[PDB]
């Protein structure tokens, strides 16, 4: 069946501390607070220019109060994990040592 979700319009919450993997990647667990779910999670790893990449192919939220694990590879050093669109978009500062 033709899998098509609109980009999430509402706000997202970080559920647990960002966890680092042994293969130089990070797992960001988030939940959706807005409407229109199931929807595609807007996700980008940028500077304060795209710097990092997404591992979880098509990150989607099924419903409200249902956390989703997003695996992503941030670049070495400084980066900003941007989850969702404005207003009140989630911007997480990350530093990979």
């Amino acid at each position, epitope marked *: 069946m033709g899998m098509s979700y609109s980009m999430c319009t*509402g*706000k997202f*919450k*970080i*559920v*647990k501390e*960002i966890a680092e993997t042994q293969h130089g990647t990070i797992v960001i*667990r988030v*939940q959706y*607070e*807005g409407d229109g779910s199931p929807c595609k999670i807007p996700f980008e790893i940028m500077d304060l220019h795209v710097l990092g990449r997404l591992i979880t192919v098509n990150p989607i939220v099924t419903e*409200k*109060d*249902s*956390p989703v694990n997003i695996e992503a590879e941030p670049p070495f050093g400084d980066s*900003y*994990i941007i989850i969702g669109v404005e207003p*009140g978009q*989630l*911007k*997480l*500062n*990350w530093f990979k040592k």
Partner: single-chain antibody
Amino acid sequence: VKLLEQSGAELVKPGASVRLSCTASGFNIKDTYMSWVKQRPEQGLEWIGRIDPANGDTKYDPKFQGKATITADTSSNTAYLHLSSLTSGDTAVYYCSRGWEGFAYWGQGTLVTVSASELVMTQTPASLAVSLGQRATISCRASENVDRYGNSFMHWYQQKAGQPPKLLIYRASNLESGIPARFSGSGSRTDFTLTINPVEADDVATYFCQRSNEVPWTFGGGTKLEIKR
């Protein structure tokens, strides 16, 4: 249907121990952190500690060390609070609460009746008298930073009598879903404010600020919002 259901009221003799349960339905406990909160009659909220039910990692406020033990059973989707050698000081309503960016879901509370270099969260004013339709500002000053990933983990709650707290604001300025636009938050670093504009009759309650960036996830002393007489 998303809900946290706690075990019934407990009558404990002084010196005895007790274990309270918190059963989740509609969601999995392993999804986020589960905290336990103590509230003595007519007093403020006291964060005991938190559990990550996925790996069983526990963190406590120093005040509850040698008193509280938080556990979880993922198969039964239940979190637990063990309290040892009870005294009248342990007589309170104990709440279980889900989440990191503010506690959106709370249990109904469990009454426990006993019968025979630290982080400071300064909430001002302790009491606020306001007329119907007025602007009300509640301040919260933390002794340490409340930042994590460049975000201020400052949350605000509304608590009415005989009811668990209700999350209003999370991440210092974000309005919780379902909460009216009259509630707003602002601030950064250590200084934070909650604004209720205009104050309605339903707004008569006790308000609490809370940090969650790092353990302890300390609540402010509270602000009792009343109507001007």
